[PDB]
Amino acid sequence: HSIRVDGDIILGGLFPVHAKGECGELKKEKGIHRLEAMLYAIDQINKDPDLLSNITLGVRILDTCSRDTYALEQSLTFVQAPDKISGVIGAAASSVSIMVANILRLFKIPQISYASTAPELSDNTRYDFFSRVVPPDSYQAQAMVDIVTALGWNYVSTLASEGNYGESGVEAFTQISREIGGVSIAQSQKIPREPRPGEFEKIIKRLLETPNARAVIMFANEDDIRRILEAAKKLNQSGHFLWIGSDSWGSKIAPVYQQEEIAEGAVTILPKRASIDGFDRYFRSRTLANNRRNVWFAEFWEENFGCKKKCTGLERIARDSSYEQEGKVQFVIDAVYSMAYALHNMHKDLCPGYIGLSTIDGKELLGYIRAVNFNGSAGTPVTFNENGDAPGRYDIFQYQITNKSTEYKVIGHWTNQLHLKVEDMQWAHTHPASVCSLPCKPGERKKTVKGVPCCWHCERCEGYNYQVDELSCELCRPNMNRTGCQLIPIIKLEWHSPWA
Amino acid sequence: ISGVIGAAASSVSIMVANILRLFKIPQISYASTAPELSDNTRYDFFSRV
Ligand SMILES: N[C@@H](CCC(=O)O)C(=O)O
Numbered sequence: 001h002s003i004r005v006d007g008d009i010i011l012g013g014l015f016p017v018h019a020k021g022e023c024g025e026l027k028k029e030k031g032i033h034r035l036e037a038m039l040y041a042i043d044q045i046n047k048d049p050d051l052l053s054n055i056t057l058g059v060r061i062l063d064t065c066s067r068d069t070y071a072l073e074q075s076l077t078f079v080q081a082p083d084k085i086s087g088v089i090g091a092a093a094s095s096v097s098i099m100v101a102n103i104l105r106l107f108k109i110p111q112i113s114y115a116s117t118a119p120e121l122s123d124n125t126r127y128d129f130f131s132r133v134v135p136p137d138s139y140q141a142q143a144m145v146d147i148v149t150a151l152g153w154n155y156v157s158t159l160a161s162e163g164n165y166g167e168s169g170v171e172a173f174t175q176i177s178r179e180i181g182g183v184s185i186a187q188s189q190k191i192p193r194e195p196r197p198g199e200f201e202k203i204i205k206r207l208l209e210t211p212n213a214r215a216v217i218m219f220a221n222e223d224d225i226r227r228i229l230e231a232a233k234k235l236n237q238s239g240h241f242l243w244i245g246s247d248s249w250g251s252k253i254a255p256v257y258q259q260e261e262i263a264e265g266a267v268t269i270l271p272k273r274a275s276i277d278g279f280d281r282y283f284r285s286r287t288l289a290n291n292r293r294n295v296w297f298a299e300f301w302e303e304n305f306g307c308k309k310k311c312t313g314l315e316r317i318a319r320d321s322s323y324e325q326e327g328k329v330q331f332v333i334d335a336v337y338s339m340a341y342a343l344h345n346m347h348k349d350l351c352p353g354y355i356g357l358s359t360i361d362g363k364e365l366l367g368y369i370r371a372v373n374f375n376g377s378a379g380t381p382v383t384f385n386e387n388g389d390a391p392g393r394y395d396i397f398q399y400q401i402t403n404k405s406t407e408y409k410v411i412g413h414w415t416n417q418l419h420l421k422v423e424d425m426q427w428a429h430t431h432p433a434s435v436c437s438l439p440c441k442p443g444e445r446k447k448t449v450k451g452v453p454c455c456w457h458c459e460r461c462e463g464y465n466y467q468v469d470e471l472s473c474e475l476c477r478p479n480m481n482r483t484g485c486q487l488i489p490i491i492k493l494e495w496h497s498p499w500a
Numbered sequence: 501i502s503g504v505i506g507a508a509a510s511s512v513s514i515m516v517a518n519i520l521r522l523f524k525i526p527q528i529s530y531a532s533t534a535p536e537l538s539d540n541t542r543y544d545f546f547s548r549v
């Protein structure tokens with residue numbers, strides 16, 4: 001099960017065409033939908049006269065099944081060269097990307113990822129040849145804490161998925177929330193990706209015990225959120241109502257299927273993306289008859305239309321079928337075009353006067369990759385930072401349930417600073433108050449009390465007063481916090497006093 | 501392959517350990533004396549005599 005096309009210079013791809021489901025079921029939105037985008041980009045590049053004249057590109061596309069070990073064991077085909085691979089364009093999960101980068105760096109094959117958002121990959125000591133078209137998962141935590149503090153939420157529960165992405169994201173979120181101030185994690189939970197009442201139902205039944213925390217921040221995978229929602233619906237319509245999800249939830253309508261009322265009013269974040277109209281025409285025209293290139297495509301059809309009853313030779317992929325372009329279909333084109341531009345610059349420099357091609361050096365090719373900027377194929381300039389990342393711009397969506405239909409609509413933005421519109425928002429309950437106790441203020445000389453780390457008494461500190469010298473009410477009207485021993489005036493019998 | 505008996509050079513041992521740790525194969529070098537391999541964060545399955 002693979003796609004092999006031959007050309008002067010060819011590239012590799014890694015996509016999660018199969019998912020665990022509820023390699024069990026095809027990933028309609030983040031599988032086939034991205035293979036077709038990569039093939040469309042390759043076809044568009046080949047016909048362009050300006051770029052790679054006399055060089056025809058090819059593809060080596062494989063399946064990861066959303067597993068790091070499986071992708072690692074099938075990425076050995078890239079190094080054993082069989083077909084020689086100039087660069088690898090496919091990586092969709094941080095766990096897959098890290099393991100693939102570890103093997104590829106040894107054999108000096110450049111890699112570009114279109115959907116992996118993990119700060120660990122920002123390290124260039126251990127990942128020399130890794131490049132990225134999306135921002136690292138460090139601005140996303142800042143955006144989530146900004147959303148949490150803007151609406152006054154200080155008592156929240158956090159859930160994460162075991163792995164690089166979930167753990168790194170939840171650690172960054174906790175650090176930024178502590179730095180922001182007043183955001184306190186009542187419960188922090190982790191999920192191991194095994195759907196079982198032992199863990200997932202226990203997570204939902206352990207979030208129940210803290211009723212004051214009515215908001216949940218989650219760093220969980222695409223498949224883990226589905227089990228979270230299913231367990232939430234089973235267990236008395238959930239006890240963790242508000243869900244502030246990261247890009248893994250994104251705006252995917254598939255996970256919330258049959259569990260819609262659970263996610264009513266949730267707020268989710270995605271990378272800022274603009275639709276590509278050119279790919280819309282390409283995808284719809286891909287019939288079962290004509291699209292023989294994709295080996296998996298037939299199976300996708302059986303899932304998409306629930307057909308084999310005999311199929312009617314009139315069904316198509318259109319607005320009725322909810323074509324619904326995936327969010328990260330613009331970064332695949334950017335990655336493929338960046339690699340093509342780097343190869344074009346390399347071959348223009350090395351052998352002037354000959355458009356055609358012998359041996360490619362990974363190090364200098366990667367040096368070319370880090371030093372190329374260009375306007376996007378149709379939407380926006382593409383460039384790499386010093387570490388190979390992309391700038392952080394995020395959009396905010398909310399799972400509103402209109403009477404007619406349930407959908408995500410944009411509710412704001414975040415580029416180093418947060419814009420939001422509360423008026424159009426709709427809530428599950430009525431803002432979801434998530435607080436424990438009133439914050440301490442220098443009201444009658446300040447205080448700070450122990451208890452549950454999320455709770456504080458904030459009583460008075462009776463007596464004298466000073467300006468900023470309040471250290472747990474420490475003495476030098478004593479105030480129990482006397483620091484007026486510094487600025488104290490000495491009074492003596494004045495000359496002009498009447499007693500004098 | 502239960503285990504791999506090392507290498508006689510530090511560069512060879514490092515390059516072999518990098519590939520072997522991914523597939524979880526223990527390694528025991530008999531003649532590599534570099535102190536870069538003393539790190540256990542990047543060389544999990546490497547040991548030396
Ligand atoms: N950024 C996510 C995946 C994003 C996606 O697949 O949509 C991760 O690191 O796993």
Ligand SMILES: N[C@@H](CCC(=O)O)C(=O)O
Pocket residue numbers: 508509510511531532533534
């Ligand atoms: N310890 C030496 C090798 C000594 C030997 O092989 O005799 C090295 O790291 O290269």
